[PDB]
Amino acid sequence: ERPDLAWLDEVTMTQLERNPYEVYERLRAEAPLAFVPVLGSYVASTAEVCREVATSPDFEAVITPAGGRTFGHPAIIGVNGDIHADLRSMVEPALQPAEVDRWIDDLVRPIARRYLERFENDGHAELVAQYCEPVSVRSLGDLLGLQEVDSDKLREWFAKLNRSFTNAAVDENGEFANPEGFAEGDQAKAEIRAVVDPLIDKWIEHPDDSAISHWLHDGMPPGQTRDREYIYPTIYVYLLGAMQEPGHGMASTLVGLFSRPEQLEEVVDDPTLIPRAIAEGLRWTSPIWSASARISTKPVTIAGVDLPAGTPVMLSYGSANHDTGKYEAPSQYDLHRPPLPHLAFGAGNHACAGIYFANHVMRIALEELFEAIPNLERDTREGVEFWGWGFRGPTSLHVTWE
Ligand code: HEM
Ligand SMILES: COc1cc(C=O)ccc1O
């Protein structure tokens, strides 16, 4: 409908999944708020527009259409008002910094060592499947009370939920172009129910220190628990992004450090630089790249576009984190980039609830990896491909050493 952006009519879903950065570089220059036809939504591409929409009193949370098809109601990312306040109060206790500091090291460090012990003397590894994803899901899985769910299964679940959640392509009429692409999401949810329903049965009668047991019990009147149908969509929120993103973050940080070998050496020599390395990794390839959204609650003007009430806007934080109005040569990883705010954890009342936990998981994992394999080198015989528009990370990370 906007004549000068008619080229957007020819942008494809596959192009956005394989490499969104060229289209979004054009968006940041041409139309920081733009309707992208294949996504069927306005998209915010710049840091200023993303932060404004995420913090605006004239917007509230909404799930993307394929995200809502995948999670249903009430997913913590998609609700507001009293329901959102309750779900935030439900998830926040185990994520409080003072609480995380009590146990995070005894949680993640033995897990990192266990996975490292399986390959640290091999001279070769694929770090996404052998280290980053397992440490991420095993840490969170244990925290949640899913100790008896294998890391293989947790990784399978987040991969299926990922593809269903981001099955965003629509046709001329705004209908999903790939309706069959939700089926594996439905299959994942059905498997999750068969595993987690007996655990919830047990936690209702015998609460313990698992996070999901506390989601059932915390803040409730005596003898009551939150209904499982009320909490399952937030369980799915965790079983996708909370399981997937710390692994994406550490893998992307490693890819960035490999691209700057002098800086990889710096960090191996001085592991106190790992937090700064991770912060730049999250900016450089944001794990949650364009998965969240808001909806206007009143008519509002953003980036010169007059939006009616009820207008969804996708927040492409991964593009916002390459805003050249903020950063110099953002496409390059640079450990020594001057520390600035970034949007990889979002903004506003729906900003990431697990920042402190997530940074610790990534930090400890990289600490133990560099301790165990200080001469880590990237297998330059194999390339690193990134995939994903909603959630983005490297599909593999082949390394060698010795
Ligand atoms: C590097 C890892 C992670 C990244 C980059 C990340 C990023 C994000 C982003 C971008 C959002 C949406 C914010 C917005 O819409 O403005 C979000 C929401 C959320 N994240 Fe994180 N996340 C990570 C890990 C985690 C972990 C490990 C947990 C839980 C232990 C978690 C819990 C949540 C929750 C509960 C929300 C929903 C908040 C709400 O809607 O009120 N995240 N995250
Ligand atoms: C923290 O987990 C999630 C976060 C988001 C943010 O947009 C979307 C789906 C998720 O599962």
Coordinates of all heavy atoms in Angstrom, one line a residue, residues 63 71 76-77 165 234 236-243 245 288 290-294 317 352 391, ligand 2:
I63 N 0.8 -11.4 21.1 CA 1.7 -12.4 20.4 C 1.5 -12.3 18.9 O 0.5 -11.9 18.4 CB 1.4 -13.8 20.9 CG1 1.2 -13.9 22.3 CG2 2.5 -14.8 20.4 CD1 0.9 -15.4 22.8
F71 N 1.2 -21.0 21.0 CA 1.1 -21.0 22.5 C -0.3 -20.9 23.1 O -0.5 -21.3 24.2 CB 1.9 -19.9 23.1 CG 3.4 -20.0 23.0 CD1 4.3 -18.9 23.2 CD2 4.0 -21.2 22.6 CE1 5.6 -19.0 23.2 CE2 5.4 -21.3 22.6 CZ 6.2 -20.2 22.8
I76 N 2.7 -15.6 28.8 CA 3.2 -14.4 29.5 C 3.6 -13.3 28.5 O 3.3 -12.1 28.8 CB 4.3 -14.7 30.5 CG1 4.6 -13.5 31.4 CG2 5.6 -15.2 29.8 CD1 5.5 -13.8 32.6
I77 N 4.1 -13.6 27.4 CA 4.5 -12.6 26.4 C 3.4 -11.9 25.7 O 3.6 -10.9 25.1 CB 5.4 -13.3 25.3 CG1 4.6 -14.3 24.5 CG2 6.7 -13.8 25.9 CD1 5.4 -14.9 23.3
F165 N 6.3 -21.4 16.0 CA 6.2 -20.1 16.5 C 6.5 -19.1 15.4 O 5.9 -18.0 15.2 CB 7.1 -19.8 17.7 CG 6.8 -18.5 18.4 CD1 6.1 -18.4 19.5 CD2 7.4 -17.3 17.9 CE1 5.8 -17.2 20.2 CE2 7.2 -16.1 18.5 CZ 6.4 -16.0 19.7
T234 N 2.8 -20.4 29.5 CA 4.1 -19.9 30.0 C 5.1 -21.0 30.1 O 6.3 -20.7 29.9 CB 3.9 -19.1 31.3 OG1 3.1 -18.0 31.0 CG2 5.2 -18.7 31.9
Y236 N 5.3 -23.3 27.9 CA 5.8 -23.3 26.5 C 6.7 -22.1 26.2 O 7.7 -22.3 25.4 CB 4.6 -23.3 25.5 CG 3.6 -24.5 25.7 CD1 2.3 -24.3 25.5 CD2 4.1 -25.7 26.0 CE1 1.4 -25.4 25.7 CE2 3.3 -26.8 26.1 CZ 1.9 -26.7 26.0 OH 1.1 -27.8 26.1
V237 N 6.4 -20.9 26.7 CA 7.3 -19.8 26.5 C 8.7 -20.2 27.0 O 9.7 -19.9 26.3 CB 6.8 -18.6 27.3 CG1 7.9 -17.5 27.4 CG2 5.5 -18.0 26.6
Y238 N 8.8 -20.9 28.1 CA 10.1 -21.4 28.6 C 10.7 -22.4 27.7 O 11.9 -22.4 27.4 CB 10.0 -21.9 30.1 CG 10.2 -20.8 31.1 CD1 9.4 -19.7 31.2 CD2 11.2 -21.0 32.1 CE1 9.6 -18.7 32.2 CE2 11.3 -20.0 33.1 CZ 10.5 -18.9 33.1 OH 10.7 -18.0 34.1
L239 N 9.9 -23.4 27.3 CA 10.4 -24.6 26.6 C 10.8 -24.2 25.2 O 11.5 -25.0 24.6 CB 9.4 -25.7 26.6 CG 9.2 -26.3 28.0 CD1 8.2 -27.5 27.9 CD2 10.5 -26.7 28.6
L240 N 10.5 -23.0 24.7 CA 11.0 -22.5 23.5 C 12.2 -21.6 23.8 O 13.4 -22.0 23.9 CB 10.0 -21.7 22.7 CG 10.2 -21.6 21.1 CD1 9.1 -20.7 20.5 CD2 11.6 -21.1 20.7
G241 N 11.9 -20.3 24.1 CA 13.0 -19.3 24.2 C 13.9 -19.4 25.4 O 15.1 -19.2 25.2
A242 N 13.4 -19.7 26.5 CA 14.2 -19.8 27.7 C 15.2 -21.0 27.6 O 16.4 -20.9 28.0 CB 13.4 -19.9 29.0
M243 N 14.7 -22.1 26.9 CA 15.6 -23.2 26.7 C 16.6 -22.9 25.6 O 17.8 -23.3 25.6 CB 14.8 -24.4 26.3 CG 14.0 -25.0 27.4 SD 15.1 -26.0 28.5 CE 14.0 -26.4 29.8
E245 N 17.6 -19.7 24.0 CA 18.3 -18.5 23.8 C 19.7 -18.5 24.4 O 20.7 -18.0 23.8 CB 17.5 -17.3 24.2 CG 16.2 -17.1 23.4 CD 16.3 -17.7 22.0 OE1 17.2 -17.4 21.2 OE2 15.4 -18.5 21.7
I288 N 16.9 -13.6 20.3 CA 15.5 -13.2 19.9 C 15.6 -12.1 19.0 O 15.8 -10.9 19.4 CB 14.7 -13.0 21.2 CG1 14.7 -14.2 22.1 CG2 13.3 -12.6 20.8 CD1 13.4 -14.3 23.0
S290 N 13.4 -11.3 16.0 CA 12.1 -10.6 15.7 C 10.9 -11.5 16.1 O 10.0 -11.7 15.4 CB 12.0 -10.4 14.2 OG 10.9 -9.5 13.9
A291 N 10.9 -12.0 17.4 CA 9.9 -12.8 17.8 C 8.8 -12.1 18.6 O 7.7 -12.7 18.7 CB 10.5 -13.9 18.7
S292 N 9.0 -11.0 19.2 CA 8.0 -10.3 20.0 C 7.3 -9.2 19.3 O 7.8 -8.7 18.2 CB 8.6 -9.9 21.3 OG 9.4 -8.8 21.2
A293 N 6.2 -8.7 19.8 CA 5.4 -7.7 19.2 C 4.6 -7.0 20.3 O 4.6 -7.3 21.5 CB 4.3 -8.4 18.3
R294 N 4.1 -5.8 19.9 CA 3.1 -5.1 20.7 C 1.9 -4.7 19.8 O 2.0 -4.8 18.5 CB 3.7 -3.8 21.3 CG 5.0 -4.1 22.1 CD 4.7 -4.7 23.5 NE 5.9 -4.6 24.3 CZ 6.9 -5.5 24.3 NH1 6.9 -6.5 23.5 NH2 8.0 -5.3 25.1
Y317 N 14.3 -6.7 17.1 CA 15.4 -6.2 18.0 C 16.7 -6.6 17.4 O 17.7 -5.9 17.6 CB 15.3 -6.9 19.4 CG 14.1 -6.4 20.3 CD1 13.4 -7.3 21.0 CD2 13.8 -5.0 20.4 CE1 12.3 -6.8 21.9 CE2 12.8 -4.6 21.2 CZ 12.0 -5.5 22.0 OH 11.0 -5.0 22.8
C352 N 12.7 -8.9 29.1 CA 13.1 -10.2 29.5 C 13.1 -10.3 31.1 O 13.7 -9.5 31.7 CB 14.4 -10.6 29.0 SG 15.1 -12.2 29.5
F391 N 13.8 -16.2 15.8 CA 15.0 -16.6 16.7 C 16.1 -16.9 15.8 O 16.0 -17.7 14.8 CB 14.6 -17.8 17.6 CG 13.3 -17.7 18.3 CD1 12.2 -18.2 17.7 CD2 13.3 -17.1 19.6 CE1 11.0 -18.1 18.4 CE2 12.0 -17.0 20.2 CZ 10.9 -17.5 19.7
Ligands
LIG2 C1 11.5 -16.3 26.7 O1 10.9 -17.2 25.7 C2 10.2 -16.5 24.6 C3 10.4 -15.2 24.3 C4 9.8 -14.6 23.2 C5 10.0 -13.1 23.0 O2 9.6 -12.6 22.1 C6 9.0 -15.4 22.4 C7 8.8 -16.8 22.6 C8 9.5 -17.3 23.8 O3 9.4 -18.7 24.1

